[PDB]
Design an enzyme around this catalytic site. Sequence first.
Site, PDB file in Angstrom:
ATOM      1  CB  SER A 162     -11.875   9.328  -1.473  1.00 58.81           C
ATOM      2  OG  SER A 162     -11.702   8.138  -2.322  1.00 58.81           O
ATOM      3  CD  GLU A 170      -2.999  -0.757   0.297  1.00 54.92           C
ATOM      4  OE1 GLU A 170      -2.972   0.495  -0.407  1.00 54.92           O
ATOM      5  OE2 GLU A 170      -4.033  -1.565   0.104  1.00 54.92           O
ATOM      6  CG  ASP A 183      -6.619   5.303  -0.607  1.00 59.29           C
ATOM      7  OD1 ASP A 183      -7.795   5.570  -0.476  1.00 59.29           O
ATOM      8  OD2 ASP A 183      -6.440   4.473  -1.463  1.00 59.29           O
ATOM      9  CG  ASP A 215     -17.150  -2.065   8.128  1.00 56.94           C
ATOM     10  OD1 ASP A 215     -17.675  -1.548   9.020  1.00 56.94           O
ATOM     11  OD2 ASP A 215     -17.281  -1.573   7.119  1.00 56.94           O
ATOM     12  CG  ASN A 226     -11.095   6.057   0.526  1.00 58.77           C
ATOM     13  OD1 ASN A 226     -12.123   6.316   0.704  1.00 58.77           O
ATOM     14  ND2 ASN A 226     -10.447   6.231  -0.431  1.00 58.77           N
ATOM     15  CG  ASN A 273      -8.744   6.755  -4.032  1.00 56.53           C
ATOM     16  OD1 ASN A 273      -9.179   7.034  -2.898  1.00 56.53           O
ATOM     17  ND2 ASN A 273      -7.945   6.031  -4.503  1.00 56.53           N
ATOM     18  CG  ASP A 293     -14.303   7.976  -4.843  1.00 54.70           C
ATOM     19  OD1 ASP A 293     -13.020   8.436  -4.716  1.00 54.70           O
ATOM     20  OD2 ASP A 293     -14.593   7.177  -4.076  1.00 54.70           O
TER      21      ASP A 293
END
Length: 129
Positions: free
Chosen positions: A50, A35, A52, A101, A59, A46, A48
């Site tokens: 957003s 990562e 990271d 989650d 995110n 990203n 969209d």
Amino acid sequence: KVFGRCELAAAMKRHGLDNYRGYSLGNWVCAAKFESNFNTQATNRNTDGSTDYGILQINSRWWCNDGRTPGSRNLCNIPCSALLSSDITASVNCAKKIVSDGNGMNAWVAWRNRCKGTDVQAWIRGCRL
Ligand SMILES: [Cl-]
Ligand SMILES: [Cl-]
Ligand SMILES: [Cl-]
């Protein structure tokens, strides 16, 4: 901060990631390598809109507030810049919420595609833990 491999393993162990929800320490080290290349200051934007952040590329659409991701949540209750610290505490504590989650470590695309199903214990070989 750019961690060494064993230095990060030791840090993650101290903060309770080893076998957290059944994921052995090498899974977490492997995820951080792919990562962020073990760099706490890593950021990536990203499509969209957003972003990271940090060593585990957490995110802003869901997990932190960066002031620039409209309509997003802040489930970890933290500014995204806290995730860039040389102290990995905030990153680890937020990762524990993510991995709990429902989708486990599949939330981390690099883990799914580069670590899952491989000999992840290799990532902690040689380290004093
Ligand atoms: Cl392991
Ligand atoms: Cl957010
Ligand atoms: Cl799981």
